[PDB]
Amino acid sequence: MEFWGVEVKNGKPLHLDPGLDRLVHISQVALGESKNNVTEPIQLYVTVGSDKLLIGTLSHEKFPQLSTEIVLERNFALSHTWKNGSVFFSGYKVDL
Amino acid sequence: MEFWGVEVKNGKPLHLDPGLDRLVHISQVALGESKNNVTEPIQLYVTVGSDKLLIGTLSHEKFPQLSTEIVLERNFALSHTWKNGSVFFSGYKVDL
Amino acid sequence: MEFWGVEVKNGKPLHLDPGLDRLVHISQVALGESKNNVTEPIQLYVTVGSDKLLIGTLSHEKFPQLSTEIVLERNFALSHTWKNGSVFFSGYKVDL
Amino acid sequence: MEFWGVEVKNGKPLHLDPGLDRLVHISQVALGESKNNVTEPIQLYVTVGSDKLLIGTLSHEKFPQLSTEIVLERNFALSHTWKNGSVFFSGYKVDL
Amino acid sequence: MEFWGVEVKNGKPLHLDPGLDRLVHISQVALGESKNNVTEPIQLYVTVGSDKLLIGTLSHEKFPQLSTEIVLERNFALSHTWKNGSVFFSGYKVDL
């Protein structure tokens, strides 16, 4: 049980690996601050072995964060559709 | 612990099997992007044997995703009432 | 770990028993579609022994579902105040 | 694992004790019916030893319930700021 | 399993240590009472080592609390951007 987190900037897929005999457990997703205040809804994706899964759609006004239980035992990528800001993903790494 | 997820397109029941001595744990539901300004509320169902259970009602305006804990040890189907878009279900498989 | 769920129709108490050395874990609650556009908040109860406990208040407009963690080791009843529709309760049974 | 719940009526702290080598796990909080009036936000507190902690703020309009994971290993008190109604807390007791 | 909680006043980082062979599990976040209207965004952070992670953005009107699952095995800091009030964080400590 080790705290884990990342900031995905401007949506470009961030490729991650839990490591041998580990899982990443993502528990918290948060929409970062806007520089402009042109806010469209922002889609969030986890890509695992190809399959690209929508996990949610955030907005500053209505959906600025999610409490989640996403469990990843293999290489994956996090990505989102906001070209001008960050989405924060956090949780913890687990053994076995 | 194996990441798992599916896209249910246009609501047609997707029949799934966790596998022998496995469970599917569904943790995240997300509503896909709409192509038009018709938004009807979209009902989501898990059908197990003779029981069709409503798990929720989504909309782009108010309810575009759910964080869930749905546990399936036997064959089931996922379905929804949106004839013109997708709902994404994700989570993980567990060994017994 | 066995998927479990029920439909409580028109609010009448549904009396249930987890069984010997079993638990019912209720993880998802969902408000059925309305035919009868009166609307009003719908209170949901779990009755265990002499205690009738409110678990929440649903509406089609604002609160059409809940994600819960309700654990029941002994006989109980589910009930709600909607006389003209259903509320769906689902989750799983656990041994030991 | 035993179902547990209480109704905290009006503004008075309810003092509770899990017992020796037990925990209370609070998983669901629900605001009781207001008998007409539109009411003010209601703050919820758990008091443990030297700490009175805000756990949230409920309203009939916007926040009538919470799904929680509050874990108490020693004597505590639940209280809230609604002088003329109830808040229901439920979950389960765990033996260590 | 020991109840844990803190009040972070006016945003100033609170530096905390779970202790040897312990984790802090943060389950509940709640926004304190405002005396006026707050116009500044209320952003919440957990800082661990070189990573400052946004966990969400609170408001009195729309997002006065979060139910979370944040796990910390290391020294960390909690902080937020509300200059004129408190955010309450609670949960429990776990051994081993």
Swiss-Prot record, chains A, B, C, D, E:
Upregulation: Repressed by abscisic acid.
Position of the signal peptide: none
Positions bearing N-acetylmethionine: 1
Compartments, record wording: Nucleus, Nucleolus
Region feature Required to repress transcription, mapped onto this chain: 2-5
Transmembrane segments: none
Tissues/organs with expression: Expressed in leaves, roots, stems, young plantlets, flowers and siliques. Highest levels in ovules, embryos, shoot apical meristems and first leaves. Also expressed in somatic embryos.
Superkingdom, taxonomy of origin: Eukaryota
The protein's assembly and partners: Interacts with DNMT2.
Cited function: Probably mediates the deacetylation of lysine residues on the N-terminal part of the core histones (H2A, H2B, H3 and H4). Histone deacetylation gives a tag for epigenetic repression and plays an important role in transcriptional regulation, cell cycle progression and developmental events. Involved in the modulation of abscisic acid and stress-responsive genes.
Sequence similarity: Belongs to the histone deacetylase HD2 family.
Name of the featured protein: Histone deacetylase HDT3
Organism this protein belongs to: Arabidopsis thaliana (Mouse-ear cress)
Gene: HDT3
Shown stretch of the complete protein: 1 to 95 of 294
